[PDB]
Subunit: 288 residues, 4 copies
């Protein structure tokens, strides 16, 4: 069974120019817009997902991530984790239900790396636009823009990664799948964490600047859809970070590109299938 | 967090001839031979898996599946599941550790459909043939035969699927992802169950005969690998049931082929990502009647 | 250099319902419509080709093919082929320019198999919808329906293959790439002919009835696109002959499907790269 | 039909060390070793080609290309071609048959760009290691190393591209498919020439030094086989130049890597289907 924290639920990013962000994400990446709220944010979800949002856009003075939340099994599991997080030593805040459109209340806290993380149990299930009975074999959203299948994860840059990991593995029920060993002596300079059987649901890399966003990732269906996302990136003059390639760490076949506002995002596919009884894989710092 | 029942752990299948059985599986299917015991069972595992075995072959007079087992999180989860299966009403058998090469003890029990299912917490980790430090994405093994990535599931034919469903969802922590609705006077004619975020770890289709194994399934990296297995099956004059195709009742692109003994197997890739909070999808009987899992055809 | 007969240029097929055949080819197959003449024929071209047309549909009381034409290098070449065909003994018919929209004059003759074949040197180049300067690798057109890349060939059914092989090899400048051997008593049941370095530009199979059309063929980019074609066909209730599969006698990974009128067509990719100096491959009858 | 110059026949390149070259091309690139003569050259051909060789390496003081030969339709075409070169103002050397293993006489000349070009009509057809009757659906050779399907072309660096262009399109019956403009006072900083219906069998870029080799290219089956070439390269610790990506000029999805001696080679796939009746595509200097 999949219990406790189930999967990445949503990332709310900051954009410099709303209209430019709404067009980029809706028409280039191919996310499906589900709503806009009186606070100025626009709600987006991957076409094949079932919940109302997985990526929220918001205008502000700088690029970067406001926060990253995960959906948990149920409301009981929400209070339980709230209590454990507190018991651990973190100050928990409770954003009331509805503060976000179609979203129940969420338990928020801040990590030693300085990132804002959320936990919620309820969020509307608008579905994927396909019938629940004999779902058709083909659908048009599938090909609107890049059109990724799900918010896969995010990679964060922050200072106290060790304290970070203990929180996730000792309290949130994640496990280390991959890690990058320090140049020497000691710790991990990068950690890939999973709360399921995916290579990872979130990853953290050691860095001084607190709360920095490296990237939010979207899973694609094949290597060819990655080449395709590449072509669509050029057609739309999207600044690309690292063209299509393989990731030693994760084995992901990916493309790193930039938002019109500087936020790095990723469209990849590939990876093995780890489970909680697995020992993590490690990479020497010189190979990182 | 992945808890309780984790994943398909092994299937023990019956081959009419042990020798030709080892060649096909290791040379055509591409599974990795990992050991052979006193009873003369020969063990295999997909190259990318980490545990000693996922597929065990035993010589016999009849083809089919002896049993199908799931790996559970830990010893404590195992004793608990054993306990809950008792409390629900099923009788439990306890197989001693070592009875299977490199495996801890397992909890066995028969379903109302007749198939024997097993649960275990321990099985030796032998690795995936690749270094644990600075690992490459693959090695020569990925190109030995079809070389599937993992034992994905199995589909079984049995008489009391409504009860099997209850057992798997209420006791074992599985959830329904998809089903085939009754011809009209509704009920369920087929069920696809997941204990993870996979479309299904196991499936059952209503059927008179008890203990029927429709097929065991192995996951391939991509659609091209599926095309490649088809070329490999052709070359080895393997008897293919239904060539590469868009499955249907599961979104998988697959090939159903036969064992030299008559055991059907599946090489496929693709699927969506369901989670425990999702509601299942449904297929109307007529639609299903056109599918690959229909008792007829 | 590619000389004489260059490539399949057009196929004219009969449909029982004009407007019902139009929606299908433009929306299911995804061909691009380029025009409609007074005879009530409508023209199509794969999106990546440059010529005004490659497939023409005419309303008639019976399905099948009217003719199949090949484009040749130039007028000189066309007049030469015209003479050469007659010197072999074949009666030649000359169709005037503009008889077909945007098409120059063609040379038409009938084979022993009962099919009509055409040669033409001129047809307006309308382009592939992409610019001539700094062209992108593709555009929206590539994802409208199946959207094949080119009219690849056709397979014809007819009675005098031996003589048909003769004409193509000795008059038209083609060569045998592959052949299916007759049961034991050796002659040729099937014939795959090339006038380029493609596995084949046309193919014939010995059959007692004359002028029969087995299928016109359309090329896709990848196995992934063949799989996609299968999905689009399923979504549109297209009657599929034989599902996605690896055809031995060509290596192509294809799908045979049916037009709403009964005209079979194929979408496939793959094969090898043969040349005029290569000896042909052979298949035994049973294997066939 | 394919007449005149059919396709790229062979490339002889120099390797600082025979043994390491023999290992790389045989076991990493996956070329099939066909032979070795008394001058110290070892011979290779792609597994799927049919002729005895497409790539010949020699131990020398430097790394570059000695010569690159094109196969022609027949002997008459060879004499024909040689005579027109001379009538063009090019002296031609005549290498006697046998000189190169399993290879007949060959016409050789030099381009104004300093490179040596060969033309030949005969080379022993060894086959592709698969039967000529009921060819197997696949062989183990197909997965031995990267294992390209054919010597697709080569790109040369040298001066006076304009001169070379004209020899090719005016004497060898090649034609321009794509060009790269110069900033202004427009001439071609780069040209892509085809003598078939391939995007190109050869290309040249304006360079001060003459006789330079930029890279020899090998064709792959699909976008996934390239990613695979990527992985195999990494596994063998081969230095990769420009990671897997979409080209633009040719549309080819490729990866450039280096020889254990410095020669750049390529393994790609993809591209359209041009013919001699097509007008070349153009790229402004800014994109190049
Ligand atoms: Fe990532
Ligand atoms: Fe299955
Ligand atoms: Fe065909
Ligand atoms: Fe190239």
């Amino acid at each position: 069974a999949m219990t406790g924290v189930l999967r990445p639920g949503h990332a709310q990013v900051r954009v410099l120019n709303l209209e430019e962000g709404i067009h980029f994400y809706r028409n280039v990446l191919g996310l499906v817009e589900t709503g806009r709220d009186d606070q100025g944010r626009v709600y987006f979800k991957c076409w094949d997902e079932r919940d109302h949002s997985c990526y929220i856009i918001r205008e502000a003075d700088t690029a970067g991530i406001d926060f990253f939340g995960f959906k948990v099994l149920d409301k009981a599991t929400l209070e339980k984790l709230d209590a454990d997080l507190q018991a651990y030593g973190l100050t928990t805040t409770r954003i009331p239900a509805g503060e976000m459109l179609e979203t129940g209340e969420r338990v928020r806290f801040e990590l030693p790396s300085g990132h804002l993380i959320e936990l919620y149990a309820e969020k509307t299930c608008v579905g994927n636009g396909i019938s629940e009975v004999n779902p058709a074999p083909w659908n048009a959203q599938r090909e609107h823009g890049i059109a990724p299948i799900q918010l896969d994860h995010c990679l964060l840059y922050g200072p106290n990664i060790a304290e970070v990991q203990k929180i996730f593995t000792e309290v949130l029920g994640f496990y280390l799948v991959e890690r990058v060993l320090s140049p020497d002596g000691d710790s991990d300079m990068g950690i890939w964490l999973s709360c399921s059987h995916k290579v990872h649901d979130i990853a953290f890399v050691e860095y001084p600047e607190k709360g920095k966003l490296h990237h939010c990732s979207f899973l694609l269906e094949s290597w060819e859809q990655v080449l395709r996302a590449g072509d669509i990136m050029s057609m739309n003059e999207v600044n690309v970070d690292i063209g299509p390639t393989r990731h030693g760490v994760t084995r992901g076949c990916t493309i790193y590109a930039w938002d019109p506002s500087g936020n790095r995002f990723e469209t990849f596919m590939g990876g093995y299938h780890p489970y909680p009884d697995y020992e993590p894989l490690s990479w020497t710092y010189d190979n990182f």
